[PDB]
Amino acid sequence: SIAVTGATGQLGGLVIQHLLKKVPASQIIAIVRNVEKASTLADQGVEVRHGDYNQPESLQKAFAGVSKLLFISGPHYDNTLLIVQHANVVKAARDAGVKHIAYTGYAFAEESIIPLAHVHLATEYAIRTTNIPYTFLRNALYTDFFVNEGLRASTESGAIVTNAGSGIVNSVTRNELALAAATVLTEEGHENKTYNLVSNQPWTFDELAQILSEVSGKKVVHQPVSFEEEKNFLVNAGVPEPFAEITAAIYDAISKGEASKTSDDLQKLIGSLTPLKETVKQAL
Amino acid sequence: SIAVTGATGQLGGLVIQHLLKKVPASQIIAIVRNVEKASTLADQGVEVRHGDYNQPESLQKAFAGVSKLLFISGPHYDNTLLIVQHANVVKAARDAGVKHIAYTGYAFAEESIIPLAHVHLATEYAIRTTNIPYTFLRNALYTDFFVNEGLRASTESGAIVTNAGSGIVNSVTRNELALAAATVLTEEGHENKTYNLVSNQPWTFDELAQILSEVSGKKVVHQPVSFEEEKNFLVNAGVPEPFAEITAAIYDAISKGEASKTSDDLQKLIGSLTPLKETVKQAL
Ligand SMILES: NC(=O)c1ccc[n+]([C@@H]2O[C@H](COP(=O)([O-])OP(=O)(O)OC[C@H]3O[C@@H](n4cnc5c(N)ncnc54)[C@H](OP(=O)(O)O)[C@@H]3O)[C@@H](O)[C@H]2O)c1
Ligand SMILES: NC(=O)c1ccc[n+]([C@@H]2O[C@H](COP(=O)([O-])OP(=O)(O)OC[C@H]3O[C@@H](n4cnc5c(N)ncnc54)[C@H](OP(=O)(O)O)[C@@H]3O)[C@@H](O)[C@H]2O)c1
């Protein structure tokens, strides 16, 4: 019995589709905040349960009798609130007698300068307190954050504008990260282990721009700018202030080597990784 | 304005008595679960407020307008519950706009084999997420845990019985640890810093027994035993099972070097440390 929180979200939806290739739908439980959004899952053989991280009682019920739990992190912007939610989740899983928990954390968190990394470490320590056999799935930033349909704005202008400088990026796709979680949940050998699930073929924004140029046939350059120019760029392109700030801070951190370390853990878990060109062409 | 949680507890009571030597009672707020227990504090000039870690709303009210908060950890035996409580506390302090927070953690936590160390690390990361200027007061085990009026049972029998083997102990008194917290709250220079507040004159249970012999005039030896012999010893001396287990696990960890690392941080903060003989004679 494998339960997946965040099941209607992007990552959780992909996990379930990967689990559906490995186990009967019978064994999969989707735990979800909005039960009406989960109908398509229930049309597949997947059991749907209500579980809201803000409501301990819902989590008690949702985790009842689950063997393996994949706890996908909350997306909230308030990190201090996210620590409460995650704590509620961990306490509910302990009380429910969950037998194995996997948690989607953040690669190389101890060296991060992004405050969200402190949430993932707080949560990993919270899970260690339960004594439940664990797998810490320490996910890179998503390649999809940087490479998406929004790249058409850059083809248009001839420029990818960021404040990442020549920082290196070890991102991987949500889909490879979903496969990794599904792999771990469906095979032995991953108990009490941490994996830093990142690329071993990192890239730069110069390189991304050369790739976009090759694919589109149109000349695009990386235009690196300052933090304040980025946030301005973003706000004036219709990106709401808090998210524009979040985004500039992620690029700023990249410029300082936040995403520059690599591991073979993911490749060892899922096999060959998707080349960035292949992801760029899909995005377009 | 300096607020102290756990104010009717042993450590918090001593902190307030130390703060009373440094600031008018006007500026001190005792935050407390049981308001009737705090009357003696209110007879001094100290403001009493209700704050229960299980009740977010109480904490919102209790932390209103406080400048500096000393968050003394919860004593609960359920570590997973303690993570929820501590998270509630941290979120309340962020919401209340607390300007500086000190938290009593556990020295060298990253190297601990005691599960309570994961709670203190989860909490430190929770505090880092708030961005509030912090002081992590990483307290050694209390010398008072080992050296107390209970040593008369050992004088009686001629033996201190433990499963600590010849493990080394860097413990310090609750009172020195209270002085350290009070010092930090009342002088500049301690913002965004962690201190491992332990002894630089560690001791063994052989040594404790020689000291008890010198003080009492009666011959007492350390009798080191196994984990299961300890727990049995303890249970049959009227120590309730969960606490007997807690105690055997603390000694077991000592036997494996849990308390063997030292730092000059405390001595640098408070001046000379209390010799163990002086603490033994007080206990008796
Ligand atoms: N590594 C990265 O680059 C990266 C980037 C962004 C996010 N993340 C983290 O990884 C997680 C998964 O990524 P994603 O792309 O799948 O994000 P996503 O599409 O935003 O999914 C977030 C999921 O969490 C659910 N959720 C929100 N609040 C909840 C609550 N109170 N109780 C229960 N569920 C709640 C959402 O439910 P609804 O559908 O009902 O709203 C949604 O299913 C995110 O939650 C976030 O913490 C990582
Ligand atoms: N370093 C060590 O060797 C060591 C040893 C033991 C404990 N500790 C930790 O350090 C802390 C202080 O040590 P201590 O000797 O002063 O312990 P203590 O005498 O047991 O004090 C614990 C304090 O926390 C309060 N408390 C319990 N539950 C609470 C709640 N739900 N909301 C608000 N307050 C609550 C208690 O209030 P009441 O008086 O109303 O019950 C008490 O004032 C402990 O909480 C524990 O986590 C450290």
Q: Closest partner residue to A80 among B79, B91, B121, by Cβ? A: B91
Does residue A45 sit in the same domain as residue A164? no
Other beta carbons less than 10 A from residue B56's beta carbon: 16
Task: Using alpha carbons, select from A247, A268, A127 the residue that is nearest to residue A184.
Answer: A268
> In chain B, what residues touch A55 (CB-CB under 8 Å)?
none
Contact B129 A88 (CB under 8 A): no
B118 touches chain A (CB under 8 A): yes
Please name the residues in contact with B206: beta carbons below 8 A apart, sequence gap of 6 or more: B166, B222
Which CATH number fits the domain that encloses residue A3? 3.40.50.720
Whether residues A181 and A51 fall in one domain: yes
CB B59 within 8 A of CB B6: no
Are B61 and B98 found together in one domain? yes
Q: Give the containing element (helix H, strand E) for A224.
A: strand A221-224
Q: Kindly report the CA angle at A267 between A187 and A272, in degrees rounded to 5?
A: 110
Resolution rounded to one decimal, in angstroms: 2.0
Q: Is the Cβ pair B122, A119 closer than 8 Å? A: no
The domain that contains A202 carries what CATH number?
3.90.25.10
- E strand or H helix at B180: helix B174-185
Please say whether the beta carbons of B135 and B269 come within 8 A: no
Contact A72, A6 (CB under 8 A): yes
Cα–Cα dist B180/A281, whole Å: 60
- DSSP letters along B218-275, please? S--EEEE--HHHHHHHHHHTT--HHHHHHHHHHHHHHHTTTT----SHHHHHHSSPPP
Q: State whether residue B129 sits within 8 Å of chain A by CB.
A: yes
The number of beta carbons lying within 10 Å of the beta carbon of residue A130 is 20
CA distances from A188 to A135, A184, A271, B25, B276 (A): 11, 7, 17, 60, 51
Closest Cα to atom 13, ligand 1: which residue? A11
B194: β partners: B136
Give pairs for B232-236: CB < 8 Å, separation 24+.
B233/B161
Cβ distance A98 to A66 under 8 Å?
yes
**A2, A8 contact by CB (below 8 A):** no
Which are the residues after which chain B is interrupted (C to N > 2.5 Å)? none
CB contact under 8 A, B118 and A125: yes
Residues 6+ apart with CB under 8 A from B121: A121, A125, B105, B109, B110
Ligand 2: nearest atom to the Cα of B11: 16
- Alpha carbons A269 and A246: distance in angstroms, whole number: 30
Residues A84 and A129 both lie in one domain: yes
Angle (CA) B260-B262-B266 rounded to 5° is: 140
If asked whether residues A72 and A120 sit together in one domain, one would say yes
| One domain, residues A50 and A70 | yes
Answer whether A72 contacts ligand 1 (Cβ < 6 A).
Answer: yes
Which amino acid appears at position B104 of this protein? T
Q: Which residues line ligand 2 (CB under 6 A)?
A: B 6, 8-12, 33-34, 37, 51-54, 72-75, 104, 139, 141-142, 145, 174
Question: Which residue of chain A comes nearest to B124, CA vs CA?
Answer: A122
Domain residues for the domain of A225 are 139-173+197-261+271-284
> Rounded to whole angstroms, how far apart are CA atoms B253 and B231?
14
How many helices (DSSP H) and strands (DSSP E) are in chain B? 13, 11
Q: What is the DSSP string of A53-110?
A: TT-HHHHHHHTTT-SEEEEPPP--S-HHHHHHHHHHHHHHHHHTT-SEEEEEEETTGG
Count structural domains, chain B. 2
Residue nearest to ligand 2 atom 42, measured at CA:
B9
Binding-face residues of A in 213-272 toward B, CB within 8 A = none
Of B81, B122, B131, the CB nearest to A122: B122
**B152 labelled ligand-binding:** no
| Beta-bridge partners for A105 | A138
Q: Is the dihedral of CA B88, B90, B91, B96 positive or negative?
A: positive
Of the candidates B54, B69, B67, B62, the residue with the CA atom closest to the CA atom of residue B137: B69
| 3-state DSSP assignment of residue A258 | coil
Return the residue in B55, B81, B82, B83 with the most chain A beta carbons within 10 A, the one to mutate for interface testing.
B83
**Lookup result for tokens 């929770």:** B126
Same domain for B155 and B120? Answer: no
Q: Based on the number of CB atoms within 10 Å of its own CB, is B274 exposed (0-12), middle (13-18) or buried (19 or more)?
A: middle
Shared-domain flag, residues B212 and B242: yes
Residues A10, A13, A17, A23: is their CA dihedral positive or negative?
Answer: positive
Closest CB to B125: pick one of A121, A128, A129: A121
Same domain, A276 and A161: yes
Please tell me whether residues A109 and A203 are part of one structural domain. Answer: no
Q: From CA B13, how far away is CA A126, in angstroms rounded? A: 29
CA B74 to centroid of ligand 2, rounded, Å: 5
By most ligand atoms within 8 Å of CB, the mutation choice from B48, B54, B70, B72 for ligand 2 is: B72
Shared domain check, B113 and B237: no
CB-based contact A83 B126, cutoff 8 Å: yes
Q: Ligand 1: does its nearest atom lie under 6 Å from the Cβ of A53?
A: yes
User: Which residues, other chains included, contact A91 with Cβ-Cβ below 8 Å and sequence gap of 6+?
Assistant: A56, B80, B81, B83, B84
Within 13 Å, how many C-alpha atoms sit on residue A55's CB side? 10
Specify whether B79 is located in the same domain as B178: yes
Atom of ligand 2 nearest to the CA of B177: 1
